[PDB]
Amino acid sequence: KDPFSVLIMGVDRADTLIYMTVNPKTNTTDMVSIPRDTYTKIIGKGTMDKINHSYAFGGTQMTVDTVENFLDVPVDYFVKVNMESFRDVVDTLGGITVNSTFAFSYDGYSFGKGEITLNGKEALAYTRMRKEDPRGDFGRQDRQRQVIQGIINKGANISSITKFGDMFKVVENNVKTNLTFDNMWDIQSHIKQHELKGTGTKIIYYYQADESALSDITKELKESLEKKLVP
């Protein structure tokens, strides 16, 4: 079918936000990571705040509305994961795999560079590391995104109806979604990750996006989401 969009939320509250467009025809995937502190209007209320606080005020629906108004593109589907439960969730699946883009050591483990398989405790540690990541909190957000995408990949590669249903029964408390089967299989792990440019200021830390770069990435995502009507 035709291109759609997915908002990945990692919740604690909504400290990880990855907006992504999928074109299943041209096999393409655009993606942009929204930093936790990004200052914007929270839709439904009458306040501008850190975007990650929208979840604490209106739940999922408020967060998706805030992300839509911020990016000026619609989000069709969402995947919300409670990151504090990574362990349980990754243990309930058969463990997951991540594409670790750089090697480090943390909490007794030494994660190498490449496709590596993680159990629950390893995934939690992989995501809790902060100081030794030269990317800062974009890096931590990227590693949490990696674990969430590994969960998605693992859930999407279950062929057995029974194993999927039992898995779901356990996991649905910590993983919410409105995806279809076809779409979840579409977003399984070419790719185009995006850098949301901006500046952080301390008056009490805030982050504010480059208005102009935001306009550019909104144009990019819009064109990626278009339904072409030709003769």
Curated annotation (Swiss-Prot):
GO terms for molecular function: phosphotransferase activity, for other substituted phosphate groups. Keywords: Cell membrane, Cell wall biogenesis/degradation, Membrane, Signal-anchor, Transferase, Transmembrane, Transmembrane helix. Its EC number is 2.7.8.-. Disruption phenotype: Single mutant has no effect on cell growth or morphology under normal growth conditions. Triple disruption of tagTUV genes is not viable. Cells lacking this gene display a considerably increased transcription frequency of lytR and lytABC operon expression. GO terms for biological process: cell wall assembly. Pathway: Cell wall biogenesis. It is a single-pass type II membrane protein. Belongs to the LytR/CpsA/Psr (LCP) family. Interacts with MreB. Interacts with FloT. This is Polyisoprenyl-teichoic acid--peptidoglycan teichoic acid transferase TagU.
